[PDB]
Amino acid sequence: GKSHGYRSRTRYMFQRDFRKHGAVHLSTYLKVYKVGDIVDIKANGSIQKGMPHKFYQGKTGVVYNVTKSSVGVIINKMVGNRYLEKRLNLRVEHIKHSKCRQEFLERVKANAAKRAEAKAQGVAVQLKRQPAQPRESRIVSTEGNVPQTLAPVPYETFI
């Protein structure tokens, strides 16, 4: 018959990695999570308690509950034609903070600093990001850079 267990098809997903097996380092236990933090989920195969299901591997969610050794995380799961709210109790070995959130907060504080310093002059702050604009005019010189002519190479076996 068919087989769809709780950890089916999780072979390479829950292998550890090359040459970093063994016990886990103490930074994962010393990291501090608060309610509202945004965290990434990546399971550790060395810890069998508080494991996430294989669906939530690589998923990103929001902390809603902090307990003794675990964290409650909220994920949005697509079921059919809508997203449902899923609450997960995961031990802290299987989560880490999302770095995109702290990058955005750094952008917020630097952006507020720019607005605050330029508010003393009113110099059209222009605080929105802009994407890659087309590159403008330039003059390239041939002083020591005379062009070298290239041609297609004929065919050879090369074995």
Q: Which does 27 bind (CB under 5 to 8 A by kind): RNA, other proteins, none?
A: RNA
For residue 2 the two structure tokens come to 């068919």
3 state SS of 18: coil
3 state SS of 64: strand
Q: Which amino acid is at 11?
A: R
Residue 112, Cα to own-chain centre: how many angstroms?
25
Using the minimum distance from each CB to other proteins, give the nearer residue, 21 or 87: 87
Binding mask 43-82 for RNA (x = CB under 7 A): --xxxxxxx-xxx-xxxx------xxxx-x---xxxxxx-
Count the neighbouring beta carbons within 10 Å of the beta carbon of residue 31.
Answer: 12
Q: Counting contacts by CB under 7 A, is residue 18 touching RNA?
A: yes
Count how many Cα atoms sit within 13 Å of the Cα of residue 116 in the half-sphere of its side chain. 6
Q: Which does 108 bind (CB under 5 to 8 A by kind): other proteins, RNA, none?
A: RNA
Using the minimum distance from each CB to other proteins, give the nearer residue, 81 or 148: 81
User: Which of 120, 121, 123, 132 forms a contact with RNA (CB under 7 A)?
Assistant: 132
